[PDB]
């Protein structure tokens, strides 16, 4: 399983952001709004292939979570679909980026702003977000935003859609890596 693939919790479906590790312990990052209140994650809608259990979740304010793998045999590729990821980097205005998600697949665009505040309502406000002109749709939450072999962010939310065009906000992945003491591979 790799970045952008579907993940299912008890409540719905999100996308895997990036496979990451600490020592010998493997985890995957995804959106905090997906990890909030989920305990177990599976690889399929039938819930027959377990992936693992939530180990951390930060939403609102931030929008990242991490799941520790409990499935021993599933391949945990350090890629996004077939694309290799080798490092993490900070987003910059004008940077060409690509997103992959379980509903819409792969779409490209550029970073249009940094440190944006996104208010999803009901007190769910997230800060410090990357703004882009890449589209996204339900199911794409938590998937990776990358640039070449560089990990940049995790899909959080936005508006519009892929048919007409949209704006999507992503959580900087560097912050998550740091919070959990993990790294891409």
């Amino acid at each position: 399983i790799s970045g952008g693939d579907a993940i299912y919790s008890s409540t719905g479906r999100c996308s895997l952001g990036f496979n990451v590790r600490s020592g010998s312990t493997y985890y995957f990052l995804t959106a905090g709004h997906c990890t909030d209140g989920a305990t177990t994650w599976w690889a399929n809608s039938a819930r027959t292939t377990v992936l693992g259990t939530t180990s951390g979740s930060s939403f609102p304010n931030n929008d990242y979570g991490i799941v520790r793998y409990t499935n021993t045999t599933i391949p945990k590729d350090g890629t996004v679909g077939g694309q290799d990821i080798t490092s993490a980097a900070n987003a910059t205005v004008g940077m060409a980026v690509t997103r992959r998600g379980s509903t819409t697949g792969t779409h490209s665009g550029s970073v249009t702003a940094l440190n944006a505040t996104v208010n999803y309502g009901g007190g769910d406000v997230v800060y410090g977000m990357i703004r882009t002109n890449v589209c996204a749709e339900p199911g794409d939450s938590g998937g990776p935003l990358y640039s070449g072999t560089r990990a940049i962010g995790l899909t959080s939310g936005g508006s519009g859609n892929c048919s007409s065009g949209g704006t999507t906000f992503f959580q900087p992945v560097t912050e998550a890596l740091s919070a959990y003491g993990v790294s891409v591979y």
Partner: protein
């Protein structure tokens, strides 16, 4: 589902579908409710789950 606090300028993108009276599957409640606003209250919920 109550779309009273809509519209919202952004929605998160988890998938938990709802079926609209327009026979379209809406990916989540935030997407569904923004569409209800956009239709000026004419779209309604047909049932939970995909259409």
């Amino acid at each position: 589902v109550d779309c009273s606090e809509y519209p919202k300028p952004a929605c998160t993108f988890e998938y938990r579908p709802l079926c609209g009276s327009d026979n379209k599957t809406y990916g989540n409640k935030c997407n569904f409710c923004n569409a209800v606003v956009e239709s000026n209250g004419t779209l309604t919920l047909s049932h939970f789950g995909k259409c």
